[PDB]
Every structure is written in structure tokens, then in C-alpha cells.
Amino acid sequence: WMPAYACQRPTPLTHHNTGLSEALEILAEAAGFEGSEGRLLTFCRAASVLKALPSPVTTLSQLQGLPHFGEHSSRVVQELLEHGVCEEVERVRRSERYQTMKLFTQIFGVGVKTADRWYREGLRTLDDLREQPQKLTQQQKAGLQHHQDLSTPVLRSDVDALQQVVEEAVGQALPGATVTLTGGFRRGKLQGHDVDFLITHPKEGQEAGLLPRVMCRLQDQGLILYHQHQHSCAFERSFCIFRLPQPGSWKAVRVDLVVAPVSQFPFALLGWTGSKLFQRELRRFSRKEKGLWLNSHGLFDPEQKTFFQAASEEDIFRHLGLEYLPPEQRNA
Numbered sequence: 076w077m078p079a080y081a082c083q084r085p086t087p088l089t090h091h092n093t094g095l096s097e098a099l100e101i102l103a104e105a106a107g108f109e110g111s112e113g114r115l116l117t118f119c120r121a122a123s124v125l126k127a128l129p130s131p132v133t134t135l136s137q138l139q140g141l142p143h144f145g146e147h148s149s150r151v152v153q154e155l156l157e158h159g160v161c162e163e164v165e166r167v168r169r170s171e172r173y174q175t176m177k178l179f180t181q182i183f184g185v186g187v188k189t190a191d192r193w194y195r196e197g198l199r200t201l202d203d204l205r206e207q208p209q210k211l212t213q214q215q216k217a218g219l220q221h222h223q224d225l226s227t228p229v230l231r232s233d234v235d236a237l238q239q240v241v242e243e244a245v246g247q248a249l250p251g252a253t254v255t256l257t258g259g260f261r262r263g264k265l266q267g268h269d270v271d272f273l274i275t276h277p278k279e280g281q282e283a284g285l286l287p288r289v290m291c292r293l294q295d296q297g298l299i300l301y302h303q304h305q306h307s308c309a310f311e312r313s314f315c316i317f318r319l320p321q322p323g324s325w326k327a328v329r330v331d332l333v334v335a336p337v338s339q340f341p342f343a344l345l346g347w348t349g350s351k352l353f354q355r356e357l358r359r360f361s362r363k364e365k366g367l368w369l370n371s372h373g374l375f376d377p378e379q380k381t382f383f384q385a386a387s388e389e390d391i392f393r394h395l396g397l398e399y400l401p402p403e404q405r406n407a
């Protein structure tokens with residue numbers, strides 16, 4: 076027996092079923108491209124079960140009694156075991172719709188709705204987008220300008236360099252302010268598509284106006300290629316492309332900087348650490364099993380109209396009746 080919710084079981088970074096999970100995640104991604112959110116979540120859940128298994132699935136008999144393994148996901152795994160290939164997955168991989176939606180949605184500032192609109196309008200390539208600049212936001216133009224670098228996996232070494240410059244700027248702008256690495260790198264990932272940082276100060280309110288000062292410092296050092304600042308309407312944030320110096324060269328790298336007041340920091344850290352499926356599952360668990368609404372700002376009882384005060388992620392897990400999972404076991 077393995078628990079049904081991803082937030083009730085450890086999911087390590089590395090596992091024994093990478094071929095099988097990858098194939099299911101192609102089908103999940105394709106479903107998302109077609110607005111089939113039910114089918115996306117179904118394939119995502121099945122893949123996450125495989126990530127949690129302590130052994131490779133070598134025969135279909137190892138599927139019996141696992142949750143989230145309905146007929147379609149089981150068929151995909153069966154075909155892979157028997158034939159080394161799943162024809163449905165190969166058709167998806169070869170299809171122009173999938174390839175194009177993958178191409179467009181990978182670009183900085185482009186979601187599924189935009190990519191689909193562009194597809195329906197006859198756009199297919201990055202050059203097609205560059206030929207229609209009136210169709211692009213400034214963020215998307217920046218994504219296209221740096222597309223090669225932004226498609227290159229960000230490495231832990233890049234993360235360490237970026238954390239140093241962000242810490243230097245934060246520390247010079249406001250002594251005592253802190254920088255916490257979040258996202259997939261906090262979960263132990265060796266590579267990623269961006270770097271996420273969470274900034275706060277132990278005195279509530281001292282973080283006010285910090286982010287623009289941090290960005291000014293970084294801009295002055297030549298480290299910023301693109302910056303879009305957004306005030307809270309809901310955390311203050313800056314979605315950036317950094318110019319990371321390397322020996323004899325440089326690389327553009329996506330970096331998200333988020334500011335949270337320290338009262339909300341545990342919720343923010345939990346929300347921003349992911350994985351995306353883990354957090355979806357944790358929020359579903361909270362609502363369905365505990366009657367509480369969890370988000371990146373707090374944990375709300377809608378019946379009592381109360382908020383839970385947490386000092387740590389551990390506090391939040393405890394309040395929900397879940398065993399604590401460190402970040403490296405949230406790789407659902």
C-alpha cells in the first residue's frame with residue numbers, strides 16, 4: 076500500500092522508473108496543451124506514483140494495487156515493457172501540434188492560451204514570431220532574444236553564482252535581510268529552467284522597498300538583461316533575465332525574485348518550493364481532508380474565518396496532520 080496523495084509519501088529526486096514516468100508526462104503535457112486538465116492531472120498522478128516506488132517496474136504485475144493507475148496509464152506502461160516503445164507517445168512526439176506548443180510554451184512569458192492562439196493563427200517557428208513583433212509582449216520579446224540560453228539547462232554552479240550576487244545586493248541594500256533559494260534547486264535538483272529566490276526581513280515591514288533597491292544594485296553591475304517588477308495587488312516580485320558571466324563568455328538565465336513579509340514566509344517557502352504537483356496535491360488534501368484553504372500566504376479555515384500562525388514549514392505539515400517531508404522528498 077502506497078498513500079493516494081502525493082503529499083502523504085516521500086518522492087525522492089532520483090528513482091527507478093524514469094522511462095515510464097517520462098512517457099506518461101509527455102501524455103500529461105499534451106493533454107494540457109489541448110485544455111484537457113482532467114487527463115493532465117490523471118497522467119501526472121500516475122507518473123508520480125512511479126517516482127515513489129522503491130524498485131523498477133519490470134513486469135505489469137507490479138502495477139496491481141497501486142493508486143492512480145487506471146486503464147490508459149497501465150496500457151502505456153504495458154506497451155513500453157513489451158515493445159520498448161508506446162505508439163501513442165511516439166505519435167504525440169512526432170506531431171506538429173505538440174512540437175509547436177512545446178516550442179512556444181517554453182518561451183519566457185508564454186502560456187498555453189497564448190501558444191494555442193498563435194498555433195491557431197498559423198505561427199509555427201521562432202522566426203514566425205520574430206516576423207510578427209506586434210503580437211509579442213516585451214517579456215516575450217526578451218524571451219525570444221535569449222531563447223538559446225534560456226533553453227540551456229541551468230546548473231547548480233550557475234545557481235551558486237547567482238545566489239552570491241543576489242545575497243550581496245540584498246545585504247548591501249538592507250543589513251539583516253535574507254535570501255532563500257526555493258524552487259527545484261531547493262528540492263535537490265541538479266538542473267532547472269530558472270532560479271527562484273525568496274527574500275524577507277525578520278522585522279515585519281522592513282522589507283518594504285527592498286526589491287527595487289536590490290534590482291538597482293544588480294542593474295548597475297551589468298547583471299540584468301530584463302526586469303519586470305510587479306507590486307503586490309500577490310507578492311511583490313521581479314521576473315528577470317540575468318546576464319551570468321562565465322569564462323570568456325556569458326549566459327542569460329531566468330531568475331524569479333519574490334519578497335514576502337516574514338509573517339507569511341513559511342507559506343511562501345512551502346508554495347515556492349514545489350514541486351508543482353506536490354503543491355496541487357497538498358492544497359487538495361487540505362481542502363478535501365481537512366476543510367482548510369492553503370495557499371502561498373496562509374492557511375485559512377473558511378467556516379471559522381481564521382488563519383493559522385506558522386513559524387515554519389514543519390508547523391504547517393503538523394497542522395494538516397501530515398508527516399513532515401523535507402524539500403528533497405517533495406519531487407512529486
Ligand SMILES: Nc1ncnc2c1ncn2[C@H]1C[C@H](O)[C@@H](COP(=O)(O)OP(=O)(O)OP(=O)(O)O)O1
Binds near residue numbers: 257266271
Ligand atoms: N514565475 C512564477 N510564477 C508563479 N509561480 C512560480 C514561478 N516560479 C516558481 N513558482 C512557484 C510555483 C511552483 O510550485 C514552484 C516552482 O515553480 P517553477 O520555478 O516553475 O518550477 P521548479 O522550480 O519546481 O522547476 P524548475 O527547476 O524547472 O524551475 O514555485
Ligand SMILES: [Mn+2]
Binds near residue numbers: 259267269271
Ligand atoms: Mn524554478
Ligand SMILES: [Mn+2]
Binds near residue numbers: 258270271331
Ligand atoms: Mn520560477
